[PDB]
Design an enzyme around this catalytic site. Structure first.
Site, PDB file in Angstrom:
ATOM      1  N   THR A  33      22.970   1.929  22.332  1.00  0.00           N
ATOM      2  CA  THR A  33      22.521   1.784  23.706  1.00  0.00           C
ATOM      3  C   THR A  33      21.271   2.591  23.961  1.00  0.00           C
ATOM      4  O   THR A  33      21.327   3.653  24.598  1.00  0.00           O
ATOM      5  CB  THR A  33      23.612   2.215  24.679  1.00  0.00           C
ATOM      6  OG1 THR A  33      24.003   3.564  24.399  1.00  0.00           O
ATOM      7  CG2 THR A  33      24.779   1.292  24.600  1.00  0.00           C
ATOM      8  N   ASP A  75      41.049  -5.993  15.708  1.00  0.00           N
ATOM      9  CA  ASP A  75      40.374  -5.003  14.893  1.00  0.00           C
ATOM     10  C   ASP A  75      41.188  -4.619  13.649  1.00  0.00           C
ATOM     11  O   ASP A  75      41.303  -3.442  13.288  1.00  0.00           O
ATOM     12  CB  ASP A  75      40.085  -3.787  15.746  1.00  0.00           C
ATOM     13  CG  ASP A  75      39.188  -2.815  15.054  1.00  0.00           C
ATOM     14  OD1 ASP A  75      38.438  -3.249  14.178  1.00  0.00           O
ATOM     15  OD2 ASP A  75      39.238  -1.613  15.360  1.00  0.00           O
ATOM     16  N   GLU A 120      38.270   4.203   8.012  1.00  0.00           N
ATOM     17  CA  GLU A 120      37.203   4.347   8.997  1.00  0.00           C
ATOM     18  C   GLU A 120      37.004   5.803   9.389  1.00  0.00           C
ATOM     19  O   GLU A 120      35.872   6.260   9.503  1.00  0.00           O
ATOM     20  CB  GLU A 120      37.502   3.505  10.240  1.00  0.00           C
ATOM     21  CG  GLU A 120      37.478   2.026   9.970  1.00  0.00           C
ATOM     22  CD  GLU A 120      36.121   1.514   9.553  1.00  0.00           C
ATOM     23  OE1 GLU A 120      35.155   2.274   9.694  1.00  0.00           O
ATOM     24  OE2 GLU A 120      36.038   0.368   9.080  1.00  0.00           O
ATOM     25  N   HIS A 173      28.306   6.775   7.031  1.00  0.00           N
ATOM     26  CA  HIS A 173      29.567   6.092   7.287  1.00  0.00           C
ATOM     27  C   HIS A 173      29.762   4.926   6.327  1.00  0.00           C
ATOM     28  O   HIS A 173      30.802   4.808   5.670  1.00  0.00           O
ATOM     29  CB  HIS A 173      29.562   5.607   8.730  1.00  0.00           C
ATOM     30  CG  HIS A 173      30.748   4.783   9.092  1.00  0.00           C
ATOM     31  ND1 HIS A 173      31.791   5.255   9.878  1.00  0.00           N
ATOM     32  CD2 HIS A 173      31.058   3.501   8.785  1.00  0.00           C
ATOM     33  CE1 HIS A 173      32.696   4.297  10.017  1.00  0.00           C
ATOM     34  NE2 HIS A 173      32.281   3.228   9.356  1.00  0.00           N
ATOM     35  N   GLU A 174      28.759   4.062   6.209  1.00  0.00           N
ATOM     36  CA  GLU A 174      28.929   2.892   5.362  1.00  0.00           C
ATOM     37  C   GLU A 174      28.953   3.286   3.892  1.00  0.00           C
ATOM     38  O   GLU A 174      29.740   2.741   3.101  1.00  0.00           O
ATOM     39  CB  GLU A 174      27.813   1.893   5.619  1.00  0.00           C
ATOM     40  CG  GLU A 174      27.685   1.424   7.048  1.00  0.00           C
ATOM     41  CD  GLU A 174      28.950   0.784   7.541  1.00  0.00           C
ATOM     42  OE1 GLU A 174      29.824   0.485   6.687  1.00  0.00           O
ATOM     43  OE2 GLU A 174      29.073   0.573   8.758  1.00  0.00           O
ATOM     44  N   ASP A 196       0.786  -1.230   0.000  1.00  0.00           N
ATOM     45  CA  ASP A 196       0.000   0.000   0.000  1.00  0.00           C
ATOM     46  C   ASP A 196       0.824   1.288   0.000  1.00  0.00           C
ATOM     47  O   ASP A 196       0.239   2.368   0.131  1.00  0.00           O
ATOM     48  CB  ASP A 196      -0.966   0.009   1.193  1.00  0.00           C
ATOM     49  CG  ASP A 196      -0.267  -0.148   2.512  1.00  0.00           C
ATOM     50  OD1 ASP A 196       0.974  -0.151   2.530  1.00  0.00           O
ATOM     51  OD2 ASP A 196      -0.960  -0.269   3.538  1.00  0.00           O
ATOM     52  N   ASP A 234      24.377   9.030  10.532  1.00  0.00           N
ATOM     53  CA  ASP A 234      25.822   8.978  10.449  1.00  0.00           C
ATOM     54  C   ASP A 234      26.302   7.555  10.200  1.00  0.00           C
ATOM     55  O   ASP A 234      27.305   7.365   9.521  1.00  0.00           O
ATOM     56  CB  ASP A 234      26.468   9.610  11.691  1.00  0.00           C
ATOM     57  CG  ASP A 234      26.042   8.983  12.986  1.00  0.00           C
ATOM     58  OD1 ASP A 234      25.188   8.067  13.001  1.00  0.00           O
ATOM     59  OD2 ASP A 234      26.597   9.418  14.012  1.00  0.00           O
ATOM     60  N   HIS A 279      32.260   4.349   2.799  1.00  0.00           N
ATOM     61  CA  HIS A 279      33.221   3.295   2.487  1.00  0.00           C
ATOM     62  C   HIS A 279      33.181   2.963   1.011  1.00  0.00           C
ATOM     63  O   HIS A 279      34.204   2.651   0.401  1.00  0.00           O
ATOM     64  CB  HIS A 279      32.923   2.043   3.288  1.00  0.00           C
ATOM     65  CG  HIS A 279      33.463   2.074   4.679  1.00  0.00           C
ATOM     66  ND1 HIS A 279      34.773   2.409   4.950  1.00  0.00           N
ATOM     67  CD2 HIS A 279      32.891   1.789   5.873  1.00  0.00           C
ATOM     68  CE1 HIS A 279      34.985   2.330   6.254  1.00  0.00           C
ATOM     69  NE2 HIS A 279      33.861   1.965   6.834  1.00  0.00           N
ATOM     70  N   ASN A 327      19.869  16.812  14.322  1.00  0.00           N
ATOM     71  CA  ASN A 327      20.531  16.774  15.621  1.00  0.00           C
ATOM     72  C   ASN A 327      22.038  16.549  15.461  1.00  0.00           C
ATOM     73  O   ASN A 327      22.593  15.609  16.025  1.00  0.00           O
ATOM     74  CB  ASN A 327      19.943  15.683  16.505  1.00  0.00           C
ATOM     75  CG  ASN A 327      18.646  16.071  17.103  1.00  0.00           C
ATOM     76  OD1 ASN A 327      18.497  17.164  17.645  1.00  0.00           O
ATOM     77  ND2 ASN A 327      17.683  15.171  17.025  1.00  0.00           N
ATOM     78  N   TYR A 350      41.693  -2.151   4.454  1.00  0.00           N
ATOM     79  CA  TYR A 350      41.092  -2.139   5.784  1.00  0.00           C
ATOM     80  C   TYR A 350      42.021  -2.784   6.809  1.00  0.00           C
ATOM     81  O   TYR A 350      41.677  -3.760   7.471  1.00  0.00           O
ATOM     82  CB  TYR A 350      39.750  -2.857   5.756  1.00  0.00           C
ATOM     83  CG  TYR A 350      38.661  -2.100   5.054  1.00  0.00           C
ATOM     84  CD1 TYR A 350      38.545  -2.131   3.668  1.00  0.00           C
ATOM     85  CD2 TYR A 350      37.724  -1.363   5.780  1.00  0.00           C
ATOM     86  CE1 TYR A 350      37.536  -1.453   3.027  1.00  0.00           C
ATOM     87  CE2 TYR A 350      36.699  -0.704   5.145  1.00  0.00           C
ATOM     88  CZ  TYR A 350      36.618  -0.742   3.764  1.00  0.00           C
ATOM     89  OH  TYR A 350      35.615  -0.073   3.110  1.00  0.00           O
ATOM     90  N   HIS A 400      39.175   0.648  13.746  1.00  0.00           N
ATOM     91  CA  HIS A 400      38.122   1.454  14.358  1.00  0.00           C
ATOM     92  C   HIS A 400      38.606   2.121  15.629  1.00  0.00           C
ATOM     93  O   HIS A 400      37.870   2.891  16.235  1.00  0.00           O
ATOM     94  CB  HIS A 400      36.879   0.623  14.683  1.00  0.00           C
ATOM     95  CG  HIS A 400      36.338  -0.158  13.524  1.00  0.00           C
ATOM     96  ND1 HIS A 400      36.693  -1.469  13.279  1.00  0.00           N
ATOM     97  CD2 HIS A 400      35.436   0.170  12.563  1.00  0.00           C
ATOM     98  CE1 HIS A 400      36.052  -1.900  12.205  1.00  0.00           C
ATOM     99  NE2 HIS A 400      35.272  -0.932  11.768  1.00  0.00           N
TER     100      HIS A 400
HETATM  101  N1  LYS Z   1      31.579  -0.879  13.189  1.00  0.00           N
HETATM  102  C1  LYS Z   1      32.558  -1.079  14.262  1.00  0.00           C
HETATM  103  C2  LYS Z   1      31.912  -0.829  15.607  1.00  0.00           C
HETATM  104  C3  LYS Z   1      30.597  -1.541  15.784  1.00  0.00           C
HETATM  105  C4  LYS Z   1      30.734  -2.540  16.875  1.00  0.00           C
HETATM  106  C5  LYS Z   1      29.484  -3.303  16.978  1.00  0.00           C
HETATM  107  N2  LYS Z   1      29.706  -4.468  17.832  1.00  0.00           N
HETATM  108  C6  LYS Z   1      33.170  -2.468  14.250  1.00  0.00           C
HETATM  109  O1  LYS Z   1      32.830  -3.279  13.402  1.00  0.00           O
HETATM  110  O2  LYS Z   1      34.024  -2.790  15.081  1.00  0.00           O
HETATM  111 CA    CA Z   2      22.727   5.409  23.895  1.00  0.00          CA
HETATM  112 CA    CA Z   3      26.374  11.639  15.057  1.00  0.00          CA
HETATM  113 CA    CA Z   4       2.565  -1.114   3.902  1.00  0.00          CA
HETATM  114 CA    CA Z   5      23.270  13.389  16.064  1.00  0.00          CA
HETATM  115 ZN    ZN Z   6      33.493   1.692   8.815  1.00  0.00          ZN
END
Ligand code: LYS
Ligand code: CA
Ligand code: CA
Ligand code: CA
Ligand code: CA
Ligand code: ZN
Ligand code: LEU
Length: 316
Positions: free
Chosen positions: A194, A226, A166, A142-143, A59, A138, A146, A183, A157, A231
């Site tokens: 969180t 990492d 990153e 961000h992605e 719809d 963001d 990349h 914002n 990477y 990161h």
């Molecule tokens: N994108 C970052 C931070 C995100 C962490 C989510 N567990 C990473 O892959 O490390």
């Molecule tokens: Ca939070």
């Molecule tokens: Ca932000």
């Molecule tokens: Ca729908």
């Molecule tokens: Ca923000």
């Molecule tokens: Zn990234």
């Protein structure tokens, strides 16, 4: 799919209503024909197989909880497309209006988003560490950045080049957040991180050390976690970018800020003209200095502030 372009309405992850460009052919698909060769948003249906199904809706109204991540992934992909087009004269991530594809509802409880080299992929989060990641402009930017980086500088990477990669995504993720005037801040991921804790974020560009990330080259991570800290050590570059834009005094070095617009123009030029797959922080400094020289002149304030910022974070 082939059909007639139209406009639907839905609610994003954060409960905000927005209009989204869709395509009608029996169903309404999350297919935006107004931007390049298209923005396409797919349902991965909680599986890890990609892209999944082009998002179909009966719809043209997307107010279901299940719909929310797709609305935002679709919408914010469009905003990011707009940012690069309008501000940097770049048509999609390859500069030739490549279709932008995103899949949402990837896996179960997946606390990440990623550009996989062909498309964007957004988990729904586990509901405690993250809510669906596409709800953060963001994050989306961000992605999608990349994709720009991988098509231009090609920063691998790993190690410092990966941290630049990153950082660039955080920088332009933030510049897009400011461009959309939603914002805006110099924090990464605050909108989807969180939900139980207010005022935090995944990373901070203004004060990376807030979350234990380095804000000086002397504090860089040298281990192997990492991918060599891609990161983690991004915080050193994020701080420098933050200083270039906003100014400040950091480890006793004072930086006159030159504003977001010039930060973006400098880093975009550095990215697309001077960086290479294996560039390190020092080369990023040179690239940013040269880009500011290109755009504003060797004796400009802008060049001076780039130098000062990298000096402040210990990147020689
Ligand atoms: N994108 C970052 C931070 C995100 C962490 C989510 N567990 C990473 O892959 O490390
Ligand atoms: Ca939070
Ligand atoms: Ca932000
Ligand atoms: Ca729908
Ligand atoms: Ca923000
Ligand atoms: Zn990234
Ligand atoms: C921006 C984050 C929420 C996701 C990204 N893939 C890391 O970092």
């Amino acid at each position: 799919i082939t059909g007639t372009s139209t406009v639907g309405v839905g609610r994003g992850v954060l409960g905000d209503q927005k209009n989204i460009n869709t395509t009608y052919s029996t169903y309404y698909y999350l297919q935006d024909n107004t931007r390049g060769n298209g923005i396409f948003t797919y349902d991965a249906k909680y599986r890890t197989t990609l892209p999944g199904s082009l998002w179909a809706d009966a719809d043209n109204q997307f107010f279901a909880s299940y719909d929310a991540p797709a609305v935002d992934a679709h919408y914010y992909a469009g905003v990011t497309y707009d940012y690069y087009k309008n501000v940097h004269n770049r048509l999609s991530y390859d500069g030739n209006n490549a279709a932008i594809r995103s899949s949402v509802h990837y896996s179960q409880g997946y606390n990440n988003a990623f550009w996989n080299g062909s498309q964007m992929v957004y988990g729904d989060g586990d509901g405690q560490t993250f809510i669906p990641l596409s709800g953060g402009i963001d994050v989306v930017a961000h992605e999608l950045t990349h994709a720009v980086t991988d098509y231009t500088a090609g920063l691998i990477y790993q190690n410092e080049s990966g941290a630049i990669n990153e950082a660039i995504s955080d920088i332009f993720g933030t510049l897009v957040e400011f461009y959309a005037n939603k914002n805006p801040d110099w924090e990464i991921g605050e909108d989807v991180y969180t939900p139980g804790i207010s005022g935090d974020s995944l990373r901070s560009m203004s004060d990376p050390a807030k979350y234990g990330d380095p804000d000086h080259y002397s504090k860089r991570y040298t281990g192997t976690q990492d991918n060599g800290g891609v990161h983690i050590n991004s915080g050193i570059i994020n701080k420098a970018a933050y200083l270039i834009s906003q100014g400040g005094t950091h480890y006793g070095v004072s930086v006159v800020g030159i504003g977001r617009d010039k930060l973006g123009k400098i880093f975009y030029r550095a990215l697309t003209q001077y960086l290479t797959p294996t560039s390190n922080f020092s080369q990023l400094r040179a690239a940013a200095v040269q880009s500011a020289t290109d755009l504003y002149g060797s004796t400009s304030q802008e060049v001076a502030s780039v130098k000062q910022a990298f000096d402040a974070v210990g990147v020689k």
